[PDB]
Amino acid sequence: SDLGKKLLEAARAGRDDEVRILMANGADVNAADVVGWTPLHLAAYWGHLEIVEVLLKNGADVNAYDTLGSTPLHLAAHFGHLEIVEVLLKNGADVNAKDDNGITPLHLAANRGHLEIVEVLLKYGADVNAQDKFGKTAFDISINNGNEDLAEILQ
Amino acid sequence: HHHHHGSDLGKKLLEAARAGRDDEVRILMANGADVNAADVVGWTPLHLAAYWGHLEIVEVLLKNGADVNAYDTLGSTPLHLAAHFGHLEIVEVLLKNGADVNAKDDNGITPLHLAANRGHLEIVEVLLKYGADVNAQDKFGKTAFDISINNGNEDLAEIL
Amino acid sequence: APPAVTISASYPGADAKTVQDTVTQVIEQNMNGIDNLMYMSSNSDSTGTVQITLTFESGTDADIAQVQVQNKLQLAMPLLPQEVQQQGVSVEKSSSSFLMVVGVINTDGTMTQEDISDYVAANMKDAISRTSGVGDVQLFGSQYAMRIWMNPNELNKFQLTPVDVITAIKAQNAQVAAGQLGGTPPVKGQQLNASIIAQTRLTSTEEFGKILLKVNQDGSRVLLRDVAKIELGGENYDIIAEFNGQPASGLGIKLATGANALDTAAAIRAELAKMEPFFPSGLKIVYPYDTQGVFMTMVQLPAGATQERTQKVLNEVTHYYLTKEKNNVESVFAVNGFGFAGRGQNTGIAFVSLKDWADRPGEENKVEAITMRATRAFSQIKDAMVFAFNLTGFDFELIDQAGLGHEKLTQARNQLLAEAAKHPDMLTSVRPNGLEDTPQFKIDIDQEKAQALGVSINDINTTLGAAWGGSYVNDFIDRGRVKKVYVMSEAKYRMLPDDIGDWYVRAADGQMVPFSAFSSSRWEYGSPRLERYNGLPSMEILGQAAPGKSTGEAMELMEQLASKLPTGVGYDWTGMSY
Amino acid sequence: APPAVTISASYPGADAKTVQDTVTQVIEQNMNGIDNLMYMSSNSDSTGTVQITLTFESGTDADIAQVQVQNKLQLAMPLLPQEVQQQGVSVEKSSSSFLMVVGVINTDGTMTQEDISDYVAANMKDAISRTSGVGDVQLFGSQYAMRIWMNPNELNKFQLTPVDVITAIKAQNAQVAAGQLGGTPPVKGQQLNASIIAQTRLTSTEEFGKILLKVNQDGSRVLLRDVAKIELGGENYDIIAEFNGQPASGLGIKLATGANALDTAAAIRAELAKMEPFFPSGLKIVYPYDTQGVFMTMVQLPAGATQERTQKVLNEVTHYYLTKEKNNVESVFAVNGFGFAGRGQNTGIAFVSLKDWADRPGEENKVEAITMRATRAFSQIKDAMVFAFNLTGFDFELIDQAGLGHEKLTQARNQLLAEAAKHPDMLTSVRPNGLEDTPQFKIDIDQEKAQALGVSINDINTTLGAAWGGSYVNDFIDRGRVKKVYVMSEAKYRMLPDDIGDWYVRAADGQMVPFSAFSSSRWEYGSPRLERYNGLPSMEILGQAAPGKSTGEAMELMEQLASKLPTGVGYDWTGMSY
């Protein structure tokens, strides 16, 4: 869709007023680019909170995944966007979603030491015994990274 | 035999026994300088004079009761240095003053091994004359005869 | 003055002779085809450093001379070892003295001497380097490097050697070119084009710490932090500085030959203004040396002197200006590890800045009298040369003409000095300019025992070299800037001879073999700095004439006692004697 | 005189085409964007030598020309083989004629030709090369190297191969950077600081023989001297010199483009005076050539003529001057293996100095008359181009413009030479300037048999190349000077094609495999010197105009004859015809 492309580039750039007119003009809420990223994906990746909110109100698929299995909750947990992680979980995002590598958002937050996000994820039912394709849990990530603050959160 | 780090007059004696200043070595001894002063590596003034070949200084220190069998931090005696560097007369004065002809350093290397490896054949005879254990072995098991085999020195193999 | 070009190369962890027999001679043997070359001199020190100085005839274009020397060395580059090439060689036209010194201190005290030096190198040196007429920039300190401080007891516990550390760092600190998806030439109908990103160079000690060295047979994993301490630290720890007795770093600014003196200076001051707004809190720029008004103080200790003893002489010099001439001295920038001549653990220099000329009244308080009094006060410091000077004897080179050797040349030098001492009516202060031999630790690898146990020699020489001297592995990115990674033993385990046996090397059958099994050591005397003049081993001798006689007679005499020297010992005049 | 810049590389044991397609073409393809460039020629001969000559317009600043060429050569330096870079690629700007020749003899007969050659290269050549105005120095001989002469019978006896010998020499003739004790950063309070001295480069034949190759399972040692003869010997054995029949050596010195002949010749005599007092007993300097007084005699034999055959032609030339012209000739400096057109086994040169002008009265005793009789006496020497000259024609290049190949350029040259013979009215003595194709040994490695036996290709090519061509390994120290270490078979075992089958290579399973088991051979012809003009394969052709007719008429006929050659063959005029 021509509108869907203008929405993707507007969501990628954080233009909330252009995103609103595109929503009112009937643009595809779930238009995906070549890599499989929806407007919710890029707004979650680039930390545009209200674009994440406006999209979800207009029926955005909170659990859309790209060609490699990554959800908008994955990107938000990876890049320290704490407020976006909460609104995604509140709008029904799968806390235990796995990509093609069996990797969960808890792994991504633990890998980058996003402790505030780790607590919010486990508060919403994140499986802490979740293993990726190599059999590594979030606890193994804390031991390997040497992050002792996280290693006591997970216990 | 393992002497300790000194002070000031001991340093001047160590600095002079190395440079070969005979007049000042005698001056400092008459003023009470420690004849067994050591530097950081454990070399006495006898070590330094035997290394750089100052035969007179070797005799003046021994006159003043210098330790003929002083050990450095690795077990090398003044006889080790003199025999290693082809200083004939010093090896004589040391042995004549009671030097341990069979002294082994930390590696088992004797003055015979050092004189044999550098091809100092005059010194290998003086060492043997004073009762050098010809079958002495280092840590690797090598004798002075094994040195000549490996070096290709057939004059030495004759002597041994 | 005759234009001069200096070549600089470095060999990490190499002694003087290793450096001379691998770098200096190879460079010197290829310095042909250079026009208007008067003579050539070189130094090879136990710091692992060469400086070859080529002096050209008067009126020579310094640009052409540098270009010709630069191009000749480019051809000799493949003849040098890989370690020297990785360090980068420099060819520079410049004067010997500094144009100005830019000091950097930290009032807050949040940055130590080591951090201040890293900031100036990582954020100030390169931009000052590219400024108008600045020929040589000398950092009084060292840029940070990813320092891996190996522990031999832990390495032996996991059957690992520094070879495994260096191998794993090169594998897991890599910048991998991995191509693209949908790249050219592409299949038709392809809609996706994206770059593939594999491994990126590491950026933090945390990343280096989790470098996986090996996994054990029970599943447990050995990380790089399990065998070493991972910290940021300088490429070298040779040079440290102080401004008015407090931690400092800085840049020594030399004027490029032919450049204007002042307009350069203002350009450095201009670029410095561009940097100040983005300094961290507490950082401040001070100007301790600006070329009346300033002078220097040289401090030279004999070879075999540590930084501790050199620092003691520097404190005494700094304490003098700050206490007994505080009415005249504004500031003192003191550097240890760097002298006027060059680098050395036994050398130092202090840049003294005076108060404004108007505030010091009378003959008693001007640079001439202050330097005379200072030199008089420093003259009784024992075992040290301490001189004070702003901004006439002979310069003599003793040449090894027939392959005699270093030891035989030393004896011939002492023979010439002893005979010159017997003519106080003629030549006084006849002295060598270089350094005396010092105790060194000769270690022999037994090849037979190494082969019987199945231990590679390169594994042995890498384990010994990387641990006790340091090893430049590869580069990493520290806050967006390319910096070096260095592998070395922690201080603890490379200080005294008994520690040699603490180091283990793995054999072909997996057995850990201590260094004591295949090595043997002894003390001996070698040189810490080896001089060459016109391609031949040489020893510079300085001196001057007695009261009331012209150097011509002085010089003529020196020629005569050089004739009675042993067979194969030549001589030549250089410097202002030429 | 048009200014010319010459690039010279070396590839030991390499043939003409191997040199052409790994060094010559790589350097040539980057020789564009160079200002005031007229043309460019090159030779790649089976000496393992390439000589690219770049000629510029008159008035071109030779200094600048050199920089530009050198700067474009850097684009190719990483692409050249390692073995070529290790020899040291050189770029120089000089005339092609010799300014003078410095001869060195030993009146006492204490020193062999090889001994005199090594002393000149080690103690004399470098200082002359660095003298201002000296464009190029050609040594009439070669500096000594540590020659390892391998025995293939003894090597096969201990399951060893030249690869093992090479690996042992790099391991045991090593210069190790071993670090320090108490090095910075130290544990605070450290007092002891000493350099660590590990392996040093070997300095004698006795030390190289001590190199342990392996320990047999029963416990005995197999040394390098047990499988090889170790001696000091030249880097190559292709240039021998004689002075009045007695063994000698020397340096051919060409003047740098634009330098003063008188001043540079005087500076060379001043430098020679600095080294005479330190000569060994018997050595003496003689001056057989100084630029009437002098003339040269060029000797050029067919390709494939050995140094033996060339010495006899030189002997007849020297015999002529010493017997029939002894009233006018003072000295004859004969050089075998080096020639006017370069360097090769089939070429030679004689430098002849007449006695004083006063003791040669009469015109028949003048330079032209003496050279006139000399060439007339050398008219009837079989299979030799022998002429003498003091120091009309055209310079023609036949270019392969469509990649026809060397063999088709030969025929196109023969068809042009045949048509030029039928026109004596216009063209006189039209002949090529290069060499004719000679028999060569073409060996084929069966990849399937090698892989089936576990014998690696690198083990094969290193074994064959090092035994039959010699391999430069690393450096060593000979009387305080860095020199090369060469590994080669003893002459005895590299003379006949059956000696190939006596060379063994160890397979992965450990079994020795003879070279006959995986290879085959046949005789074929190939060029011993490949010429290129402006990047493309060429064949230089020279002749002169007939009596009375100008060069433009002869060139016009040559242009017409050349246009009748097959398609793809072009031409161009160079040198004196440009």
Numbering used by the authors:
A (entry chain E): 12 to 166
B (entry chain D): 6 to 165
C (entry chain B), D (entry chain A): 39 to 329, 569 to 668, 678 to 864
Paper text:
Upon antibiotic stress Gram-negative pathogens deploy resistance-nodulation-cell division-type tripartite efflux pumps. These include a H+/drug antiporter module that recognizes structurally diverse substances, including antibiotics. The superfamily of resistance-nodulation-cell division (RND) efflux pumps plays a key role in intrinsic MDR in Gram-negative bacteria. These tripartite complexes comprise an RND transporter in the inner membrane that acts as a secondary active H+/drug antiporter extruding a vast spectrum of structurally unrelated drugs through a periplasmic membrane fusion protein channel connected to an outer membrane channel factor across the outer membrane. A comparison between drug binding of AdeB and Escherichia coli AcrB is made via activity analysis of 20 AdeB variants, selected on basis of side chain interactions with antibiotics observed in the AcrB periplasmic domain X-ray co-structures with fusidic acid (2.3 Å), doxycycline (2.1 Å) and levofloxacin (2.7 Å).
We obtained crystal co-structures of trimeric AcrBper in the LLT conformation with doxycycline (2.1 Å), fusidic acid (2.3 Å) and levofloxacin (2.7 Å) by soaking pre-grown AcrBper/DARPin crystals in the presence of doxycycline (6.25 mM), fusidic acid (5 mM) or levofloxacin (5 mM), respectively. Like rhodamine 6G, levofloxacin interacts mainly with the hydrophobic side chains of F178, F610 and F628. Despite these obvious physicochemical differences, the AcrBper/levofloxacin co-structure shows the binding of levofloxacin at the same planar level as the binding of rhodamine 6G, albeit slightly shifted towards Y327. The main interaction partners of levofloxacin seem to be the conserved AcrB residues F178 and F628 (F623 in AdeB), as well as F615 (W610 in AdeB). Largely planar, heterocyclic compounds including doxycycline and levofloxacin fit into the DBP groove and upper cave region, interacting efficiently with polar side chains and hydrophobic residues of the Phe-rich area. The shared binding site for levofloxacin with rhodamine 6G that is seen in the AcrB co-structures and supported by the mutational analysis data (except for F136A), does not seem to hold true for AdeB.
